[PDB]
Symmetry: none
Subunit: 380 residues, 2 copies
């Protein structure tokens, strides 16, 4: 979801105190209701804060800094007031179209400082322009050659910071900062939040409002890696049946590599009264949440599912997770036993899954001990 | 200044519909905005017209047929598709240098069929070259001895035609035309338009677009 230190949302462009002309342009362009990032990032930008926003490429994001920037432009001033940087000529040109359209009912000049341009037209455009958009290299060159005066600049937008940095624009971006008024508001939009952006964020921004995407991490520390060698694929079921004698409730989830296995296991288990909840990557939306509600409530201590749902499966209050089938792809091991924030994971390997479980210890660095006869302990 | 029968001008390279990599190559090379001849000559060449253009020596003229020729190349075909001729080895090498730069973000092979070159490497170079550039004699010789296959050639550029003719390459240039597939697009750049040039134009070009200088 969204993690932010601003906590203030506006749900409609009408409630943003937008100049009437800009607002006509917002609706005229096709914007109806603010998107998730627009409901949070526009106001803080308008208000003058330095803002760091994690936003995927798209018209929603472009609208965000475009709308805000147009709202802070002093039409009376016929000099650059806002500078927007992009990774490529094309992206810059697209941004210039968006702002232009948004300003369809206003009279603000927007210059594209990009490759392929007679410096005579470039000088002329950068003189009277109120919003300048271009690529780092070209922008820096024009600032150094005095063709682009930056004293009236009040806002600095860094679109796709990650891409710009990874494209090799770090030096020029850093140099642009020192060539812009020290008080300039800094706004940075980025799909990812790598150290490169964090570095810029920390060196150039001031107590910025941060609007980030939640996500989470791996983690195999809240869980204990225990395995059992059934030797033959055929002896797994009985080994799993014996486990349910020294566990005492706890409720567990069991993952299989194939859908059929999930059913056979479910069948064999139900043929013995074992009330198990089975879920496959195909049940309609209305049926999947029905089985989950039955598990996260209606008794049902066991929950069997395939490896494909591991990512979407919200391992509820489970103190035990069983791997009937050792994951096919090492990467999906944690998706099955991750937990982002007690924890026991038991693996059922045969006389073939050998060295295969070691890869899950090479792909990682955690220890997968053997399961001792004493189980009533391993589960609190 | 210019007298043309094509009159259709383009002022920016963005408006020319160039493959993205080639365009990256154009700006990458230092080209900013199309010069007078580039504004008129590139598009007709790309479009397929036999073109006769009065242009003085220069990176502007070179860029003109180089950019067009690069847009027309078919990446999948690994055989000579364009043949460019210049009056001297030096001039040819310069041209190879210009198209190579222009093709920096592309994967095009450019072979120079010029003087002093092991008939072995010359052979290997022409086998999979997509753009071949060189002097009339060396090219004619390589076509006869069969080291240079021409069946895939779609464009024939004659740079500084007046100079090549004034240097005595007339016979060879004429022979090459007959050794190239009949439909090959013909492009001829020349500072002056003497009868030698007019004769070539009338004998080998088909209802060509003509881009000339006032006079």
């Amino acid at each position: 979801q969204i993690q932010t230190n601003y906590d203030k949302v506006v749900y409609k462009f009408d409630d943003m105190e937008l100049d009437e002309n800009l607002l006509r342009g917002v609706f005229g362009y096709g914007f109806e209701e603010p998107s998730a990032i627009q409901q949070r990032a526009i106001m803080p930008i308008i208000e003058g804060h330095d803002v760091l926003a994690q936003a995927q490429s798209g018209t929603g994001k472009t609208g965000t800094f475009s709308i805000a920037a147009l709202q802070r432009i002093d039409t009376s001033v016929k000099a650059p007031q806002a500078l927007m940087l992009a990774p490529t000529r094309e992206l810059a040109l697209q941004i210039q179209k968006v702002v232009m359209a948004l300003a369809f009912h206003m009279d603000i000049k927007v210059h594209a400082c990009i490759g392929g341009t007679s410096f005579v037209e470039d000088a002329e455009g950068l003189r009277d322009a109120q919003i300048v958009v271009g690529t780092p290299g070209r922008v820096f060159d024009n600032i150094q050659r005095r063709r682009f005066r930056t004293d009236k600049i009040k806002m600095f937008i860094l679109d796709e910071a990650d891409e710009m940095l990874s494209s090799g624009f770090k030096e020029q971006i850093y140099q642009i900062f020192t060539l812009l008024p020290p008080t300039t508001q800094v706004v940075l939009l980025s799909a990812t939040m790598p150290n490169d952006v964090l570095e810029v964020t920390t060196k150039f921004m001031r107590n910025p409002v941060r609007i980030l995407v939640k996500k989470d991490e791996l983690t195999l520390e809240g869980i204990k890696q225990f395995y059992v060698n059934v030797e033959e694929e055929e002896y797994k079921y009985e080994c799993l049946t014996d486990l349910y004698d020294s566990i005492s409730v706890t409720q567990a989830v069991i993952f299989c590599n194939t859908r059929r296995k999930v059913e056979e296991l479910t069948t064999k288990l139900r043929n013995d009264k074992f009330t198990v909840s089975a879920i496959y990557s195909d049940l309609p939306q209305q049926e999947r949440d029905t089985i989950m509600k039955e598990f996260r409530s209606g008794s049902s201590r066991i929950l069997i599912s395939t490896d494909l749902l591991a990512r979407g499966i919200d391992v509820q209050q489970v103190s035990l997770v069983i791997n009937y089938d050792l994951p096919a792809n090492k990467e999906n091991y944690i998706h099955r036993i991750g937990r982002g924030g007690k924890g026991v994971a038991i693996n059922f390997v045969t006389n073939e899954d050998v060295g295969a479980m070691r890869e899950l210890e090479k792909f990682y660095s955690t220890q997968i001990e053997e399961l001792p006869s004493d189980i009533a302990t391993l589960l609190n």
